[PDB]
Amino acid sequence: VKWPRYIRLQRQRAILYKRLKVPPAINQFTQVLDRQTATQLLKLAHKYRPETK
Amino acid sequence: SSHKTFRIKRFLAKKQKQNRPIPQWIWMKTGNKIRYNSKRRHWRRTKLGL
Amino acid sequence: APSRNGMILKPHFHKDWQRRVATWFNQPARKIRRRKARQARARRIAPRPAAGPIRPIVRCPTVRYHTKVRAGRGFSLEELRVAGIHKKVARTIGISVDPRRRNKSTESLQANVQRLKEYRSKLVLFPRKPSAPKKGDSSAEELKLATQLTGPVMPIRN
Amino acid sequence: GAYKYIQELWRKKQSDVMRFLLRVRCWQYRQLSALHRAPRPTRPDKARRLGYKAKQGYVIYRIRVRRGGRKRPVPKGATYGKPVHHGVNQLKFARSLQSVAEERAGRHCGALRVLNSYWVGEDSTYKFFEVILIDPFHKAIRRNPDTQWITKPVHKHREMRGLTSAGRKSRGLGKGHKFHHTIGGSRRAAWRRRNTLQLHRYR
Amino acid sequence: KIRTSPTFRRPKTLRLRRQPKYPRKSAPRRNKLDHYAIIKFPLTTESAMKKIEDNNTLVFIVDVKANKHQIKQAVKKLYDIDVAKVNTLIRPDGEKKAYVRLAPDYDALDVANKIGII
Amino acid sequence: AKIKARDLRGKKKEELLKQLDDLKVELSQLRVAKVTGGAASKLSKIRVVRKSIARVLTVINQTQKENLRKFYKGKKYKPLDLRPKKTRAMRRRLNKHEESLKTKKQQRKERLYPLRKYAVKA
Amino acid sequence: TKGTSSFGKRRNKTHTLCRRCGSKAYHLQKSTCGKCGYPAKRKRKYNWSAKAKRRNTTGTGRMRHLKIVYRRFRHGFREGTTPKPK
RNA sequence: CGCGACCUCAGAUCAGACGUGGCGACCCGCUGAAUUUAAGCAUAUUAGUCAGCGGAGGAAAAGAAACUAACCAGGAUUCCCUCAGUAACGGCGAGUGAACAGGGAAGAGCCCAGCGCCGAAUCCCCGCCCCGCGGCGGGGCGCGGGAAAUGUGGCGUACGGAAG
Ligand SMILES: [Mg+2]
Ligand SMILES: [Mg+2]
Ligand SMILES: [Mg+2]
Ligand SMILES: [Mg+2]
Ligand SMILES: [Mg+2]
Ligand SMILES: [Mg+2]
Ligand SMILES: [Mg+2]
Ligand SMILES: [Mg+2]
Ligand SMILES: [Mg+2]
Ligand SMILES: [Mg+2]
Ligand SMILES: [Mg+2]
Ligand SMILES: [Mg+2]
Ligand SMILES: [Mg+2]
Ligand SMILES: [Mg+2]
Ligand SMILES: [Mg+2]
Ligand SMILES: [Mg+2]
Ligand SMILES: [Mg+2]
Ligand SMILES: [Mg+2]
Ligand SMILES: [Mg+2]
Ligand SMILES: [Mg+2]
Ligand SMILES: [Mg+2]
Ligand SMILES: [Mg+2]
Ligand SMILES: [Mg+2]
Ligand SMILES: [Mg+2]
Ligand SMILES: [Zn+2]
């Protein structure tokens, strides 16, 4: 498909983060704790949610 | 030109009614300076623009 | 083609000067307009000093003029904090302040502090509400004897 | 606070982290069009320094000006006149590319009012700038007494009288001994006060 | 969903109709080209009265914004007589002349005596 | 006889139109009497009937809007005709509320340090 | 031949009367006006002829609205009031 | 595969507003010549002038020191007298040419971002009620909708400031 320019722009940006030699200060955000740890973190953090309106 | 457009015929219709002379009771008025219609237009002499 | 003898001279009329000429035929019109505006301001601030706030003793700079004493911009805040007048209240009661001025000396600072105290002894502060007086305030019988002075408040003599 | 950290972060532009970020943003902004609305600033600290507050009514554009000097817009060579004014291609424009970037968005949005502007990226052939604008008829600024000064009709098109921070810096404007030729309002007001005759009445 | 065609086109979005919170104008504008100020006067020339007698028609001066349908409905409302056809021209002085050919059961000379021209 | 704008204001909406079309009919008959060759007693009246048309239509067009801007006055969105048509710059100047309101830091400054009435001695 | 003979061949006119300035300068092939510059949004106006400006500046025609605002200014644009009746 | 957030980006005759164009004497930003002078002429000069373009207001611009100074020190801006036809520039030729100081006119100062601390303490819009409403505002109710933590408001800004 001849995609629109914003779709082609964001997909090529996602490809450039794979091509380019990404510095470690930006590479460090790729390593995220796994989904068995994230559910534990969010079940603890759901207790202490701030009050709403 | 017998193929006139409407705005040109509209223009000619006004320039034809402006060619009428003064009414002869105008020079009976008190503060009048006008002897005759001075902006008259003869169709040989001045060709109206357009 | 200069003649026999005289100054050879440089008139600056080589530009187009007749287009940019300032004729002063509204000179007496402005000398009426300014004094009408000044009378209106002096009526508008009704007991207050007509010249404006009080402005300090200053020395001129620059060797030609340092023997003389001028009126300055405003009382320095070092000269205010040792006179006891707060930096915000001074401009309310009629004391010009500028924070930019230093004080290199001690004689000038003591002269301006003495000038502020001699001013504060002379102002007649009216109550902020006319019925009930307060503590930082002048007496009732002194309120009838107030008037606008003309010219600069405590004019600077050399 | 985080703004001191990201200010000192954006100061280190020659570093590899910010160099990677500048070239990725410059690729993206070069692919995208000439004058489009950014939804939020790329420099949230610098926008706050220049005047932006994240409330309803402030609008950020990133625009690109085409980089380079200014050759003389004249047919082929042929600037007719004396050999002083024979210069064509090494001429430089009086205002800056950031001021041109302000006035292009200020002309593209005539309803809004250019507050200020800043730098996001560059390459060999473009400069990019985020000019931040204020919608002067929104009630979140016409009811705010410290930003309703821009809703007054005096400040229509600050970018084209040259009253912004980057439009100001080409006026020769400032205090000092360096700026004698603009005392008065401008370098035209200075010239006009100097080149008149005050022919008095009496003389 | 499978992309059958290798082009991308704009998806058809919903859009509402104008439901304004106040009308722009306060009240609709009065019809200034009505059935009285659409017909100025009838002519009384000999070429118009000779047109009235044999042809069984009327000759009017109307203003130049009027359709033949408007002149037909105007003459039928004013003088309550049916109209066969309408022929219009614009005179060289600039105003429209209309020729209202009447129904054959309606004579033009009697309705001319009614409308005042003789 | 002499129709004037005072007593037309008490009339109701259909009565004014029933007088309007009667004056229209009388103007049309006077135009026909102008064309056929009529007396000066009618070619003078041809102005009176036109200004009578105007005097009636003024009363309709005034009472219609005197009803409309009383219908719309309690509402926040008035039509552009009923909005006040002064000059363009003063229909978009800041209003008497949002020009009057002051930030509370400036309210504290003009609270703590008001301008005093005073006078100095000679 | 270039003179009296060649003055006969002219029948197809270049310009016509414009529909903004009203003058006869609407060039038919260029579709633009000579005096007002019609398809451009801005009025054609140059001050190398003040005598071309003062033919139609603001003081020329009817001023059918600005005439009224010049006399509505001198009461402060008093609107919505009527004077007190008898 | 679906459902849901968010982020980027479209679409509307969506709800409500805003810009366009003119005059242009005065003001601001840019562009900007040649006649002319040099007894020629090319640098200079005319000149940041005419013409060109954009933007305004009832005035604009400037403006509260990254200042002047070198003194016993002055103190935002603008205008006037003066400095001064001076210092200076210039085929050092023709020509060009300010400022500081002093005297006056006027006189007014201030606000953010940051550093922080306060349970977003902040703002916009719609719905209903009361008042006023021809400069759409004040109050009350909305387990009604958004903005905003990618930072709104209060204190606070170089004259220091905050807390105890
Ligand atoms: Mg002939
Ligand atoms: Mg001799
Ligand atoms: Mg030269
Ligand atoms: Mg300013
Ligand atoms: Mg610089
Ligand atoms: Mg041709
Ligand atoms: Mg123009
Ligand atoms: Mg809409
Ligand atoms: Mg304009
Ligand atoms: Mg020469
Ligand atoms: Mg010579
Ligand atoms: Mg020569
Ligand atoms: Mg020059
Ligand atoms: Mg010019
Ligand atoms: Mg105006
Ligand atoms: Mg101003
Ligand atoms: Mg400062
Ligand atoms: Mg000075
Ligand atoms: Mg030499
Ligand atoms: Mg020069
Ligand atoms: Mg001085
Ligand atoms: Mg004085
Ligand atoms: Mg604040
Ligand atoms: Mg904060
Ligand atoms: Zn035209």
PDB file of C-alpha atoms in Angstrom, chain C residues 47-49 88 92-94 122-126, chain F residues 109 112-122:
ATOM      1  CA  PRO C  47      -2.213  68.690  49.202  1.00  0.00           C
ATOM      2  CA  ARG C  48       0.835  66.842  47.871  1.00  0.00           C
ATOM      3  CA  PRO C  49       4.051  68.623  46.794  1.00  0.00           C
ATOM      4  CA  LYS C  88       8.138  50.327  49.719  1.00  0.00           C
ATOM      5  CA  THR C  92       4.098  55.918  49.114  1.00  0.00           C
ATOM      6  CA  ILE C  93       4.813  58.806  51.482  1.00  0.00           C
ATOM      7  CA  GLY C  94       6.679  60.677  48.768  1.00  0.00           C
ATOM      8  CA  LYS C 122       8.136  67.997  58.011  1.00  0.00           C
ATOM      9  CA  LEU C 123       5.579  65.849  56.202  1.00  0.00           C
ATOM     10  CA  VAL C 124       1.966  66.003  57.377  1.00  0.00           C
ATOM     11  CA  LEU C 125       0.614  62.525  56.691  1.00  0.00           C
ATOM     12  CA  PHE C 126      -3.131  62.552  56.348  1.00  0.00           C
TER      13      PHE C 126
ATOM     14  CA  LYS F 109       0.899  45.438  46.843  1.00  0.00           C
ATOM     15  CA  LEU F 112      -0.022  46.866  51.971  1.00  0.00           C
ATOM     16  CA  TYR F 113       1.353  50.036  50.376  1.00  0.00           C
ATOM     17  CA  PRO F 114      -1.456  52.410  49.401  1.00  0.00           C
ATOM     18  CA  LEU F 115      -0.735  55.877  48.108  1.00  0.00           C
ATOM     19  CA  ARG F 116      -1.029  58.244  51.042  1.00  0.00           C
ATOM     20  CA  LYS F 117      -2.518  61.694  51.200  1.00  0.00           C
ATOM     21  CA  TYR F 118       0.127  63.990  52.642  1.00  0.00           C
ATOM     22  CA  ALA F 119       1.678  67.446  52.502  1.00  0.00           C
ATOM     23  CA  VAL F 120       4.981  68.881  53.614  1.00  0.00           C
ATOM     24  CA  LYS F 121       5.684  72.043  55.554  1.00  0.00           C
ATOM     25  CA  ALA F 122       7.485  75.014  54.054  1.00  0.00           C
TER      26      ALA F 122
END
